[PDB]
């Protein structure tokens, strides 16, 4: 039993809600919140910009030190950093950005990072400004993640379409 509330159950381990991931994180304070990161951990917009703003830019400061030490992530890769005021940890995961020409096949590799964590609050990878089809992202999530994932979908119209079309 956990403290996530109001989710629709899609499968044994995947749940979905119409919610702002920032507000969800502030309420639940989960062990792991997933960021929709880019390889440079430049949290300018989308989910990343919103999560960073909620940390008063502390996420960006920590991320800049991480990159200065380690260099960029790989597309499909991840790193674990602090969750600041939002969660214990933030798992920064880089899905392919279709608006950059990146291979959508890397979406499965990105979701594999979730399997290293028993429970996560997450957005749909490569959705929104990363330009992939969110219906496709949900399918890859369900077919790849085996740990317990609570998906927050900001857009109510999109949430309803994802539910209604789910196979
Ligand atoms: O959910 C997405 C990604 N974007 C966000 N998701 C959750 N919380 C968020 N807060 C700010 C942005 C944001 C992908 C699925 S379709 C609707 C958009
Ligand atoms: Cl977005």
d(CA 92, CA 12): 24
Ligand 1 pocket, residues with Cβ under 6 angstroms:
20-22, 46-47, 50, 123-124, 127-128, 134, 152-155, 158
Closest C-alpha among 118, 53, 131, 124 to residue 88: 118
Instruction: Answer left, alpha or beta for residue 112, where phi above 0 means left and psi between -120 and 50 means alpha.
Output: alpha
Domains of the chain listed by start with CATH number: 8-163 (3.40.220.10)
153 CA to centre of ligand 1 in angstroms: 5
Considering only CA atoms, which residue is closest to atom 1 of ligand 1? 153
Way the structure was solved? X-ray
Strand partners, 90: 33, 81
Asked if 4 and 27 touch (Cβ cutoff 8 Å), the reply is no
Contacts of 4 (CB under 8 A, 6+ apart): 15, 17, 28, 30, 121, 150
Q: What are phi and psi of 13, to 5 degrees?
A: -125, -5
Asked if 120 and 150 touch (Cβ cutoff 8 Å), the reply is yes
Asked if 109 and 103 touch (Cβ cutoff 8 Å), the reply is no
Asked if 4 and 28 touch (Cβ cutoff 8 Å), the reply is yes
Q: Of the residues 23, 140, 154, which should be mutated to test ligand 1's pocket, given the most ligand atoms within 8 Å of the CB?
A: 154
Q: 3-state SS string over the chain?
A: CCCCCCCEECCCCEEEEECCHHHHHHHHCCCEEEEECCCCCCCCCHHHHHHHHHCCCHHHHHHHHHHHHHCCCCCCCEEEEECCCCCCEEEEECCCCHHHCCCCCHHHHHHHHHHHCCEEEECCCCCHHHCCCHHHHHHHHHHHCCCEEEEEECCHHHHHHHHHCCC
Which of the ligands is closest to the CA of residue 153? 1
- Resolution of this entry, Å: 1.0
Residue 13 to residues 24, 44, 58, 78, 91: CA-CA distances in angstroms? 18, 31, 31, 21, 18
Which of the ligands is closest to the CA of residue 130? 2
């Amino acid at each position: 039993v956990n403290s996530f509330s109001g989710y629709l159950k899609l499968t044994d381990n995947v749940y979905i809600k119409n919610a702002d991931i920032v507000e969800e994180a502030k309420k639940v304070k989960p062990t792991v919140v997933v960021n929709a990161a880019n390889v440079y951990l430049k949290h300018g917009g989308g989910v990343a910009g919103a999560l960073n703003k909620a940390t008063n830019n502390a996420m960006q400061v920590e991320s800049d030190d991480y990159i200065a030490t380690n260099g960029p992530l790989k597309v499909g890769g991840s790193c674990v950093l602090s969750g600041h005021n939002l969660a214990k940890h933030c798992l920064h995961v880089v899905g392919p950005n279709v608006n950059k020409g990146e291979d959508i096949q890397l979406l499965k590799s990105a979701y594999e990072n979730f399997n290293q964590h028993e429970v996560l609050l997450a957005p749909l990878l490569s959705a929104g400004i990363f330009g992939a089809d969110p219906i496709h992202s949900l399918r890859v999530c369900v077919d790849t993640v085996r740990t317990n994932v609570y998906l927050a979908v900001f857009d109510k119209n999109l949430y309803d379409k994802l539910v209604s079309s789910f196979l």
